[model samples]
Target: NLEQKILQVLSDDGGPVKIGQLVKKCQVPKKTLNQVLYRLKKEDRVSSPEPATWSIG
Candidate 1:
């Protein structure tokens, strides 16, 4: 659900989202969220435009 939520937000945003905003929108802690993001990144499911922003890959 967390990864799906993240992907859904990114898709709905239609653009990259900064970590803070994403956290707020997803209601996930930064540490836990980043962990999920890292896994997704390795799977090519998500990516960061910079160190602080995320978008669907």
Candidate 2:
């Protein structure tokens, strides 16, 4: 699930991160990023503190 990669990036930064930053760091398509994050966001595995801003739970 490319979900692991998402968590790793968020945890590595140790703070709320932007979707664009994650896309830049992960080099994943914006569509894929949106999908993955949306799924994770629903699972409570991560959170969006603001628009496009996220942090791990």
Candidate 3:
């Protein structure tokens, strides 16, 4: 679960963020980022306000 790491980045920014930003910040593979964010989306830990945009919830 890159969940914690995802949370950290989101929390640090405390605003709607972009998948590309996360990719740059986390240095994770795009595939891995997709999976983790998809899981987090289902879990209600993060939200996508727009395509490719995300925010902690």
Candidate 4:
């Protein structure tokens, strides 16, 4: 669900997004969202400027 929410947020943004905003928009906990984000990063589906921000690739 977190992953789905993340993808939806990225698709909605159409570009890079701040992690805080994503968490707020997705209505998910930071830690849980971070885990999903990490997985997305590892899969090369997303990228991050630092640890708390990300964008679709």
Candidate 5:
């Protein structure tokens, strides 16, 4: 649910979000949130502008 919320926020934001921002928004640990991000990226549903920044595809 939170991960989907995160994706929704990113879809609305229309720009890369920092890991810290995602962590805060998702209210999840950076490690766990990053795991979700990795999966999204791997699935080509998202993109990373920088190491810890991401945006929707």
Candidate 6:
């Protein structure tokens, strides 16, 4: 559910979101979320235009 929630939230933003926003909104641990984002990036599900920004692809 957290994964789905993160994806939906990112999709709704319609733009890149910083890690702080994701942490606040998703209520997931930063470390865990970072790992998730990493995998998602590898899978091409999310993109970071810069170092800590993220957006659904």
Which tens-of-lDDT digit does each residue in 1-57 have in candidate 6?
Answer: 777888988999989999999999999888888888988999999999998999988
In candidate 3, what are the lDDT values of residues 1-57, reduced to their tens digit?
A: 577888899999999998889988888887889898988899988898898788988
- Please write out the lDDT profile of model 2 over residues 1-57, one tens digit for every residue: 578888999999999998889989888987898898898889988899898898998
- List pairs with backbone clashes in candidate 1: none
lDDT of 4: 0.85
Cα lDDT, model 4, residue 10: 90
lDDT of 4 at 15: 76
Point out the worst 10-residue segment of candidate 1 by lDDT: 14-23
Instruction: Give the whole-model CA lDDT for all candidates, comma-separated.
Output: 0.89, 0.88, 0.87, 0.85, 0.86, 0.90
Which stretches in model 2 have alpha-carbon errors above 4 Å? none
TM-score against truth, every candidate: 0.92, 0.90, 0.88, 0.85, 0.89, 0.91
**Model 3, residue 55: what's the lDDT?**
90
- Point out the higher-scoring one by TM-score: 3 or 6: 6
Q: Of 1 and 4, which scores higher on lDDT?
A: 1
Query: Which regions of candidate 5 fall more than 4 Å away from where they truly are?
Result: none
Pick by TM-score: 5 or 6, better one: 6
Worst 10 residues of 3 by lDDT: 1-10
lDDT of 1 by residue, 1-57 (tens): 998999999999988888898889999799988999989999999989899789999
Better-scoring candidate (lDDT), 4 or 5: 5
How many clashes show up per model? 0, 0, 0, 0, 0, 0
